[PDB]
C-alpha cells in the first residue's frame, strides 16, 4: 500500500535450559503491523530455524524518517526471486523518506522485473552521505549545479467535454 517502516523484535520462547533468549531485530517495510510481523517471521524462518510457534514478538515499533523533508540520495540493496532464479540489485532512488524510496523501488520491480511484494527482499537502504558516492546517472543527473528544466508540452486536464478554444501547450 503506502508503506511504513517497522522494527520487529522477537526471540525464542524461554526454557528451563535457557532464560532470556537472544533478541533479534529487523527493520521491515510494510503497509501495516500484521504484514510486517508476518514478514519478520518469514525472514526469521529463513535465517535460522526459529519457528513462529516456538518464538514470540517482543516489540513492534514504527520507524519514521529523522528528516522527512530533506531530499536524500538513497542506495537500496535488493535480492529477489524473479522470474528464473535469484539476483542482487542496487538502485539509487533520489527521494525524501526511506518508506517512499522503498515504495518507489517496489513499484520499479513490479514494472520492470515483474516481481510481487512477496518476491522482493530489501537488504539495506542507505542515505548516500556524499553526492560523489552516487553511481547511477539517472540520479546523478539531478545533482548538478543550478539545475533547471522546463516541462514542455503541458497538457491541460479539462473538466468539460467540449471546449471553445484550441488548447495551448504553453509554459
Amino acid at each position: 500500500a503506502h508503506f511504513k517502516e517497522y522494527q520487529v523484535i522477537g526471540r525464542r520462547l524461554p526454557t528451563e535450559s535457557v532464560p532470556e533468549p537472544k533478541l533479534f531485530r529487523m527493520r521491515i517495510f510494510a503497509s501495516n503491523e500484521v504484514i510486517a510481523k508476518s514478514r519478520y517471521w518469514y525472514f526469521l524462518q529463513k535465517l535460522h530455524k526459529v519457528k513462529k510457534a516456538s518464538g514470540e514478538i517482543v516489540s513492534i515499533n514504527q520507524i519514521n524518517e529523522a528528516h522527512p523533508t530533506k531530499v536524500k540520495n538513497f542506495g537500496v540493496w535488493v535480492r529477489y526471486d524473479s522470474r528464473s532464479g535469484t539476483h542482487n540489485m542496487y538502485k539509487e532512488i533520489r527521494d525524501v523518506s526511506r518508506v517512499a524510496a522503498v515504495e518507489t523501488l517496489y513499484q520499479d520491480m513490479a514494472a520492470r522485473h515483474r516481481a510481487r511484494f512477496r518476491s522482493i527482499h530489501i537488504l539495506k537502504v542507505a542515505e548516500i552521505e556524499k553526492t560523489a558516492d552516487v553511481k547511477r546517472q539517472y540520479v546523478k543527473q539531478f545533482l548538478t549545479k543550478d539545475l533547471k528544466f522546463p516541462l514542455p508540452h503541458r497538457v491541460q486536464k479539462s473538466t468539460k467535454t467540449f471546449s471553445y478554444k484550441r488548447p495551448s501547450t504553453f509554459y
Binding site: G75, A126, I128, K135
Partner: peptide
C-alpha cells in the same frame, strides 16, 4: 556497486569474533 561495501564488510568481519569468543568457558 553498493557504495558502503567496505563499511559493512568491516562491520560483519568484526562480528565473526562472537561465533568463537563466547562458546567455551
Amino acid at each position: 556497486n553498493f557504495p558502503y561495501k567496505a563499511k559493512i564488510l568491516e562491520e560483519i568481519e568484526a562480528k565473526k569474533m562472537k561465533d568463537l569468543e563466547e562458546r567455551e568457558l
